[PDB]
Design a protein around this ligand. Structure first.
Ligand SMILES: Nc1ncnc2c1ncn2[C@@H]1O[C@H](COP(=O)(O)OP(=O)(O)O)[C@@H](O)[C@H]1O
Ligand SMILES: Nc1ncnc2c1ncn2[C@@H]1O[C@H](COP(=O)(O)OP(=O)(O)O)[C@@H](O)[C@H]1O
Ligand SMILES: [Mg+2]
Ligand SMILES: [Mg+2]
Lengths: 373, 366
C-alpha cells in the first residue's frame, strides 16, 4: 500500500469498475476535470454507459475484461464492493490502483468488518458469528433479546437481515442461516443515525465532509439532513482516525454510525466508496464527494476543508417515489432532481434523488414528510 | 409548448464546451442527449447518448437530429437564420430563429435595439464611400467601423484611408468609440409562461478581445439598470433558455447594451460552483418546459479565469497543488495559444485579494 503514488494530469484515463449511478457521478466529475473514462459493467443499460469514453460490458469476475480495463487506463477505481478481493489483488499488482485490495477484502464480509473495527479499538456493537444452527444458542446467551441476524456476504439496503425480538422469531432466523453464513449483533435502541464521508489522498492527505444525519425507511436510506442536528463530528473523527490505522483508504469512503437512546456512538459499517448519504454535497458544498474522489485517486492535492455553502435535505427516489411524485417534478425546481436513467423501474430500486437546499432544515424536513406520505 | 419529462431526448447543435456542459446537466437530470458537430474530437462527444458527425449546414443530418429528438437547442451561433427558421417550423426548437437572425447583422441588431428603447451606442450605417463623412459629423472622433455581416478603429485623419478601404466592397456599421470604465454581463433564463430568472451581475475583463476574468458580484452597482434593459430587449426578441446580455459602462458611468448571446455564455460558467443553479441547469429546465427557480442565489463570491492554450503552457504543472482552483478542462486534443481549453473558478470571500493573486499568477502568459 503506497503512501505516495502517481500524480495524473488531465488527459489521463480513469477506469471504473461498476456503472451504477455512483460510477456515473464519478465519471461526470472526471470528464468535467478533463480525464477520460472507461467503465466496466455487465449491463448494457448501466447509467454510466454514456458518460464514458469507452464501455466494456463484462462481469465483475471476468479476468480478461478486467485486464483489458487495466490496459486502457492510467488509474483504476471501483464503484461498488462487488469484485472479488482475489481478482483485485492480481490487478493492483499489475496496474495502478492506489485504493489497493485490503479495503475491499475486509469490508466485503460483515464478520471481517466487525472484527477489524473492534481490533482498531473503535466502539462496535457487540457481535458474534453464526454459520450453524447451534451458534444461535450462543447468540441468545451472549447478546440477549433483542438482537439481529445479518448475512455476511450479500446484503445491501436492509436485505438479508432478520430481527429477533422474542423466541417466536428464531424460526425466521434459522431459515436465513440454513442458506448463508451470518453474523448476530445487539439490536440497539437508536435515536439518530449519522455518517461521515471522508477522502484520503496522496502523502497522507485527508478531508472530511460535514456530518450528515440519516433516516432510513424499510432499512433503505430515505432522508439525509446536513448539518446533522446532533453534535458528534469530533467523536466521529476520532473513530475514523482509529479505522485508518488498520485499513488503507484512498479516495472517498464513508463510515456509518449509530447513536444510542443514551447518546452513545457506535461504528456500524464502512463503505469504501462514495455513499448514498453524500449525494447532497453536489449542490450544498464547494466540493462534492465525487470531485474529491477523482482528485484523490489521480493523486492531486485535496482541499484541507469542505464548506457547507447551504444546509440541505436530500431524499432518495425509489421507483415507488417516482410513481407518487413524478408529475409534480416540473413545478419544483428547488428539488434539484437527479434521475439516474435506469430503464427498469421497480418499487424499491433507487432511481434518482433530490436535494433541497434550505435555510430552515426543520421546516423542509416537515415539508418532505408530508410529500412522501 | 412541449413540457418534457425525464427520459426524453435533447438534441444539441454544436459539440464544443458549451454543448458539453449542457449535456452534463441534461444527463444528470435524466434526459438523453444527441449532439451534432463536424469534429469527431468535439468535447461533447462522450457525454451524449448519440453523436451525429456533420456540418451545421448539412440539412439531412439536421433532419436526422430532429427525428431523433424531443427538443433541439443550439450551443452557439453555428447555423444560418433561414435554415434554422425551417428547422423551428418542422421540429421543437424553443430558442427559435428570431434572435439568431437579428444578430447576424449588426445594423438590424442596432436598429431593433434602438426601436426597443434600450441604450445603444450611437451609430450610423456606412454603406457608401461618402457616408464616412456623415459619420464624422454625427459620431466624431473617435468612432469605429464594423462589417455589417459575418463576424477597425478610426482615431483621426490617418486611419481614414484604412477605413475607406473596408467600405470599398463590404457594407459597414459605424459607432462611437467609448472610453470604457467597466464591462458587465447579465445572464438570464427565460422559460414557459413568461418566467424570467436573473443570475448575479457579472464583471468581465477582456484581453486581446478574449474573455480573461469574470468577477461576481460585479464591483459596480448596475443590476437594476441592467435588468431594465433586459426587460426591454425581451419585448422585442424571443428567448427561451439562458442568454446573456453584455454591457459597457463608460467613464461617466453611462450603461450601454453591447451585444446579446442567445445561449449560455462564457461569463456565466462560474455559476456551476458559486450559485445554487448553473446557467446550464436552468437552460435545460427552460428548454424542456419545466418551471424555473424565482431567483438565483450567489452562495459564495467567485473569480473565474479562462484557460487558453498559453495559460495551460504556463500553469498546468501547478494544477495538482490547487484544488481551490476548481479546474474544468474541456478535453480538446489540439492545444493552441489563444484557443479556450478550460476555465477555473475560484470561490473566495475576498474577491479583491483573489483578483491580485490571479493577475500575479497569469502574468507570465501576457
Ligand atoms: N444493531 C442494530 N440496532 C438497531 N438498528 C439497526 C441495527 N443494525 C441495523 N439497524 C437498522 O438497519 C439499517 C440497515 O442496517 P445495515 O447493517 O447498514 O444494512 P445495510 O448494509 O443493508 O444497509 C440501519 O441503518 C439501522 O437503522
Ligand atoms: N464603443 C466602443 N468603445 C470601446 N470599445 C468598443 C466599442 N464598441 C466595441 N468595442 C470593442 O469590441 C469588443 C466587443 O465585441 P466582441 O469582443 O466581439 O464581443 P464580446 O463582448 O463577447 O467580446 C470589445 O472588446 C471592445 O474592445
Ligand atoms: Mg447501511
Ligand atoms: Mg467586449
Amino acid at each position: 500500500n503506497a503512501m505516495n503514488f502517481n500524480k495524473l494530469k488531465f488527459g489521463a484515463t480513469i477506469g471504473i469498475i461498476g456503472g451504477g449511478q455512483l460510477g456515473k457521478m464519478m465519471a461526470q466529475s472526471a470528464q468535467k476535470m478533463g480525464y477520460k473514462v472507461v467503465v466496466l459493467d455487465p449491463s448494457e443499460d448501466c447509467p454510466c454507459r454514456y458518460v464514458a469514453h469507452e464501455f466494456i460490458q463484462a462481469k465483475y469476475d471476468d479476468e480478461k475484461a478486467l485486464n483489458q480495463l487495466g490496459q486502457k487506463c492510467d488509474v483504476i477505481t471501483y464503484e461498488f464492493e462487488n469484485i472479488s478481493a482475489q481478482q483485485l489483488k492480481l490487478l493492483c499488482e499489475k496496474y495502478n490502483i492506489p485504493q489497493g485490495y485490503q479495503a475491499i477484502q475486509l469490508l466485503q464480509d460483515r464478520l471481517t468488518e466487525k472484527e477489524t473495527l473492534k481490533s482498531a479499538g473503535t466502539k462496535v456493537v457487540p457481535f458474534i458469528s453464526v454459520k450453524e444452527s447451534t451458534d444461535i444458542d450462543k447468540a441468545i446467551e451472549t447478546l440477549g433479546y433483542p438482537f439481529i441476524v445479518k448475512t455476511r456476504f450479500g446484503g445491501y439496503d436492509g436485505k438479508g437481515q432478520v430481527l429477533i425480538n422474542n423466541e417466536k422469531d428464531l424460526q425466521e432466523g434459522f431459515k436465513l442461516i440454513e442458506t448463508s453464513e451470518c453474523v448476530a449483533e445487539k439490536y440497539l435502541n437508536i435515536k439518530k443515525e449519522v455518517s461521515l464521508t471522508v477522502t484520503r489522498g496522496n502523502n497522507n492527505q485527508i478531508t472530511f465532509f460535514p456530518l450528515q444525519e440519516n433516516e432510513h425507511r424499510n432499512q433503505i436510506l430515505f432522508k439525509t439532513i446536513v448539518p446533522a442536528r446532533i453534535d458528534k463530528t469530533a467523536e466521529a473523527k476520532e473513530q475514523v482516525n482509529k479505522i485508518i490505522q488498520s485499513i488503507h483508504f484512498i479516495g472517498t469512503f464513508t463510515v456509518e454510525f449509530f447513536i444510542d437512546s443514551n447518546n452513545q456512538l457506535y461504528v456500524n459499517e464502512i463503505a469504501p466508496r462514495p455513499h448514498n448519504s453524500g449525494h447532497y454535497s453536489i449542490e450544498a458544498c464547494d466540493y462534492s464527494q465525487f470531485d474529491t474522489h477523482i482528485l484523490a485517486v489521480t493523486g492531486q492535492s485535496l482541499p484541507n476543508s469542505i464548506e457547507l455553502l447551504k444546509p440541505a435535505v436530500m431524499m432518495n427516489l425509489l421507483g415507488k417515489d417516482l410513481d407518487l411524485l413524478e408529475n409534480e417534478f416540473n413545478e419544483h425546481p428547488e428539488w434539484h432532481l437527479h434521475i439516474y436513467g435506469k430503464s427498469e423501474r421497480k418499487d424499491s430500486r433507487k432511481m434518482g434523488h433530490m436535494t433541497v437546499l434550505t435555510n430552515d432544515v426543520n421546516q423542509t424536513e416537515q415539508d418532505m414528510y408530508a410529500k412522501f406520505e
